[PDB]
Design a protein around this nucleic acid. Structure first.
Ligand SMILES: [Mg+2]
Ligand SMILES: [Mg+2]
Ligand SMILES: [Mg+2]
Ligand SMILES: [Mg+2]
Ligand SMILES: [Mg+2]
Ligand SMILES: [Mg+2]
Ligand SMILES: [Mg+2]
Ligand SMILES: [Mg+2]
Ligand SMILES: [Mg+2]
Ligand SMILES: [Mg+2]
Ligand SMILES: [Mg+2]
Ligand SMILES: [Mg+2]
Ligand SMILES: [Mg+2]
Ligand SMILES: [Mg+2]
Ligand SMILES: [Mg+2]
Ligand SMILES: [Mg+2]
Ligand SMILES: [Mg+2]
Ligand SMILES: [Mg+2]
Ligand SMILES: [Mg+2]
Ligand SMILES: [Mg+2]
Ligand SMILES: [Mg+2]
Ligand SMILES: [Mg+2]
Ligand SMILES: [Mg+2]
Ligand SMILES: [Mg+2]
Ligand SMILES: [Mg+2]
Ligand SMILES: [Mg+2]
Ligand SMILES: [Mg+2]
Ligand SMILES: [Mg+2]
Ligand SMILES: [Mg+2]
Ligand SMILES: [Mg+2]
Ligand SMILES: [Mg+2]
Ligand SMILES: [Mg+2]
Ligand SMILES: [Mg+2]
Ligand SMILES: [Mg+2]
Ligand SMILES: [Mg+2]
Ligand SMILES: [Mg+2]
Ligand SMILES: [Mg+2]
Ligand SMILES: [Mg+2]
Ligand SMILES: [Mg+2]
Ligand SMILES: [Mg+2]
Ligand SMILES: [Zn+2]
Lengths: 86, 52, 134, 50, 122, 25
RNA sequence: CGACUCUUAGCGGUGGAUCACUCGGCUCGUGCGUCGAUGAAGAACGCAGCUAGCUGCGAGAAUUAAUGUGAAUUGCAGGACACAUUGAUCAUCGACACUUCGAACGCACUUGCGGCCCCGGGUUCCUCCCGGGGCUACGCCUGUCUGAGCGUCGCU
RNA sequence: AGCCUUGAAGCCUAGGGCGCGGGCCCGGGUGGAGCCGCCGCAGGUGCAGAUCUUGGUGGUAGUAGCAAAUAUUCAAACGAGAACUUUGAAGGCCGAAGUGGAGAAGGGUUCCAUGUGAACAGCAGUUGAACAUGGGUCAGUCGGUCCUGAGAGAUGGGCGAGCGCCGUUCCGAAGGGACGGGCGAUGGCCUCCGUUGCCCUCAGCCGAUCGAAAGGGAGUCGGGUUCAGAUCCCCGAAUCCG
RNA sequence: GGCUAAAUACCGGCACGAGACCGAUAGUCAACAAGUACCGUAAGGGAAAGUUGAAAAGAACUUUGAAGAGAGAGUUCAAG
RNA sequence: CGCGACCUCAGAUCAGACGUGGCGACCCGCUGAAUUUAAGCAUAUUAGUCAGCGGAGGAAAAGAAACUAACCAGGAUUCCC
């Protein structure tokens, strides 16, 4: 009874959504994410998984602010100016 | 919240509110059941709002 | 031969930039030659096709001497629609056929303030090169 | 369950709205390739995990 | 009768806000028409009035900020949003004056023994 | 007339938010 | 006879090999070599007239302003007293804007509780209730203010 | 000064031939846009196997099988179509430790109405938890929210190359509060009461914070009402807290 | 006790150019709504999938059938 | 007792600043194996390498001799032969 009969007894969720990385790896009892290490300040990252790093590295998401720096960089980060009005 | 909704409905349509009930729908929208004061006829007010 | 180090002749790079060209670039791509009369008058060879120009179809099934007005510049499909350049569907309704701008000749230009400004600049540049050879 | 959190009830709602067929005019777009919503879900065949 | 941002530039704050309210009322009346069988003309008007509202709010924010900048111009301490953004590292550099500083020992050395211009015969 | 039309430096203290004003008062 | 079976061929199926194509890879080289408490990377949730995904954007939400451009966008519809100095569209991008979480910051992570100041509506100055706005995290340096010591002293 | 839209590659061929052979040429057919000879260069260069990899297809084979829990029948209706749907009538079963009426965990729209009968529901279906289009969850009083439990966990401190770990009162100047009293400053229903700042006085708690939809924890019941919600909506009658 | 450019490094980034390279079981896992669908409590694992036509001209209308499906007809150089 | 200097040490939502996290191809400081070779294996090798931790910049580190030499002497660091 270590198989089919036991699989019916499982109705208690070990993990839930993590509020930092949004993955269902937040261990409820330990209060820790098995994916990103929250609540640890530093992000959980290891070099024995390159595939894991490229799933959640810079550029895999929105790049909300970085991709505007890339635009501003090409004009020397000019500020407080406008093109000569018509 | 129910206070803000009551203040909004009154100001927008110049009507009076008796109570506000609210539920959040399964699709994530909040529905307000705004009961007007007895001297306000909701069917009349609906015509003003264009609902009917 | 091309010598500019920053201009690619790579086949795939050039095709990706043709089929993903933004609208204001597709306009320049969608240019047409001018009739021999217009060419002589304005000293210009080609113009970016525009709505309300009148053109002749010089290649394909609908070629002929019929001058028709351009009724739609469908830039997404890289075609223009012309008066009477059309056919019927199964249910008998009429539908325009898309001619490429490079396969027509502009016989009358829809002129306005900006078209004239465009026309003068092209001739001014042409005349400069003319006096470079001389 | 009936006892729900706001965060869970909200995540469920987004899954509810994504679960619909495509507009039929999408078929008539110029370069369109999509034939159907290939990301459909059934509450019984495949589970959300949360 | 389109809301062009050029027509709003000079207007006063209370005037523009009044203009904003008309547009907010006009939109909520349209949102009603969306679900009660409004004509296709009225459905297309929604985007026209959503962007009109955004045009008004842009001019209100720009006019307010242009005047705030005039207000803090000479002030030593300006609110953070009025300070140059650039990048975080670019804001921690030695400024132009501090980089140009030299010690008197180095200033004397450059005066006494400046680099010269010379040539060596072939 | 419809055709005729259709064919062609100092701070403003009113625009300062009311909060900033009180702080200088 | 004839069924059935075998072989070959024509035609038809099943299947998707081959060939041709290539808005994708891979490798080399070059220029630059730029994130974040002024809130990054990442995540969540929203935003389209009809829109699920991809894509873009943030309640000003498939974008505002400005500049260049110069007549479209387009699957269908529509045209705001939209469209030629009353500028469609696209590009650019310096102005403005940028929901929730996140180093993530009032305390906690359930949209749970506060506190301080200002403002507005309730009534009717105070209270009280409601709403809005601004603050309220750790360490650390310079200075400030307020203190402690049977620490070392001086005058009383 | 090769071939090719007067038809390339590819593919098919009881067509004609060449070579010991590896192979190749020509005829016919299909196809629709590129290919080949010679001299040299280069190689990810030749498949029958590896219980080889991936994909496709056989015989087996219309075969095993569609047999756990007693059971169906008659008439009518819709409908192209009925053993299976619906209504009526029979005969049966679960037999209040139920095949009944409700919940917790889990599911997440499966709920309700209408429509379809393509795919799915290992026969069928006019039917469905399928598909399609639209709806539906309303609270001071029912829970959460608060308490603390086993425990988890900051700061002080200790350790630690370091991300950090230990630790929970232990090496801590750990109270931001107050009746009242004295001073000023401000107010208003300026009478006198408030507010605010300072000073005097008084203060164990001694451990931040988290930790239970079954523990502790004030206070809502009756009648009606929907396709689907009701101790939540409506009618009525109460109550706790501030 | 201390500072110091250049020549040097650069499989991440932004923007480019090329190749005796691969050519959809190849080449990146990813030519495409791919780190997607999907699996696992989780750390992680992780595909398949390109091609009508020059142009949608994407087959009106008639007829059998409940329909799927057919027979005629029509477009196209070709639906062989 | 009181007042006042200094010293040491505390509390502030005190005025103004600054650090945190990410990326990590290249760079710097640590920590650091075992598969493997030795036809066995323990030193050795693998290897100061993988994995682990920290810190950067457009480069980093290094760098103007407590050097090399032993010559008739050279003359910071870094890179190539
Ligand atoms: Mg457990
Ligand atoms: Mg030319
Ligand atoms: Mg199941
Ligand atoms: Mg000196
Ligand atoms: Mg959407
Ligand atoms: Mg604009
Ligand atoms: Mg413009
Ligand atoms: Mg809780
Ligand atoms: Mg044969
Ligand atoms: Mg072709
Ligand atoms: Mg090869
Ligand atoms: Mg083989
Ligand atoms: Mg049988
Ligand atoms: Mg029941
Ligand atoms: Mg039951
Ligand atoms: Mg069946
Ligand atoms: Mg049902
Ligand atoms: Mg009640
Ligand atoms: Mg608690
Ligand atoms: Mg601890
Ligand atoms: Mg409880
Ligand atoms: Mg140094
Ligand atoms: Mg393939
Ligand atoms: Mg593939
Ligand atoms: Mg592949
Ligand atoms: Mg294949
Ligand atoms: Mg192949
Ligand atoms: Mg193929
Ligand atoms: Mg053919
Ligand atoms: Mg301060
Ligand atoms: Mg050995
Ligand atoms: Mg051996
Ligand atoms: Mg051994
Ligand atoms: Mg070694
Ligand atoms: Mg390493
Ligand atoms: Mg690190
Ligand atoms: Mg760092
Ligand atoms: Mg940097
Ligand atoms: Mg250095
Ligand atoms: Mg040297
Ligand atoms: Zn996480």
């Amino acid at each position: 009874t270590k198989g089919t009969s036991s699989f019916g007894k499982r109705r208690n969720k070990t993990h839930t959504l993590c509020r930092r990385c949004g993955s269902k790896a937040y261990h409820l009892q330990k209060s820790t994410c098995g994916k990103c290490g929250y609540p640890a300040k530093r992000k959980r990252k290891y070099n024995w998984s390159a595939k894991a790093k490229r799933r959640n590295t810079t550029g895999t998401g929105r790049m909300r602010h970085l991709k505007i720096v890339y635009r501003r960089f090409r004009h020397g980060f000019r500020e407080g100016t406008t093109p000569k009005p018509k | 919240n129910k206070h803000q909704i009551k203040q909004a409905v009154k100001k927008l349509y110049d009507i009076d509110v008796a109570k506000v009930n609210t539920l959040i729908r399964p699709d994530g929208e909040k529905k307000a059941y705004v009961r007007l004061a007895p001297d306000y006829d909701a069917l009349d007010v609906a015509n003003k709002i264009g609902i009917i | 031969m091309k010598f500019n180090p920053f201009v690619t002749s790579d086949r795939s790079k050039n095709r990706k930039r043709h089929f993903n060209a933004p609208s204001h670039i597709r306009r320049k791509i969608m240019s047409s030659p001018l009739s021999k009369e217009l060419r002589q008058k304005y000293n210009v060879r080609s113009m970016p096709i525009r709505k309300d120009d009148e053109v002749q179809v010089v290649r394909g099934h609908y070629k002929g001497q019929q001058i028709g007005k351009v009724v739609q510049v469908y830039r997404k499909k890289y075609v223009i629609y012309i008066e009477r350049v059309q056919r019927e569907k199964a249910n008998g309704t009429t539908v325009h056929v898309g001619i490429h701008p490079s396969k027509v000749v502009i016989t009358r230009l829809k002129l306005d303030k900006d078209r004239k400004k465009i026309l003068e600049r092209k001739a001014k540049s042409r005349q400069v090169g003319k006096e470079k050879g001389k | 369950s009936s006892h729900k959190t706001f965060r869970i009830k909200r995540f469920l709602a987004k899954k509810q709205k994504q679960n619909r067929p495509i507009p039929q005019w999408i078929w008539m777009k110029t370069g369109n390739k999509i034939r159907y919503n290939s990301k459909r879900r059934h509450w019984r065949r495949t589970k959300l995990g949360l | 009768a389109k809301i062009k941002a050029r027509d709003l530039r000079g207007k006063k704050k209370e005037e523009l806000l009044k203009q904003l309210d008309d547009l907010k009322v006009e939109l909520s009346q349209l949102r009603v028409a969306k679900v009660t069988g409004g004509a296709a003309s009225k459905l297309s008007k929604i985007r026209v009035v959503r962007k009109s509202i955004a045009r008004v709010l842009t001019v209100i924010n720009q006019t307010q900020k242009e005047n705030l900048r005039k207000f803090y111009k000479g002030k030593k301490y300006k609110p953070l949003d009025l300070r140059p953004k650039k990048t975080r590292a670019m804001r921690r550099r030695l400024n132009k004056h501090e980089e140009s500083l030299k010690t008197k020992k180095q200033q004397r050395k450059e005066r006494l023994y400046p680099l010269r211009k010379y040539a060596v015969k072939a | 007339e419809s055709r005729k039309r259709k064919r062609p430096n100092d701070v403003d203290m009113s625009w300062i938010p009311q909060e900033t004003l009180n702080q200088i008062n």
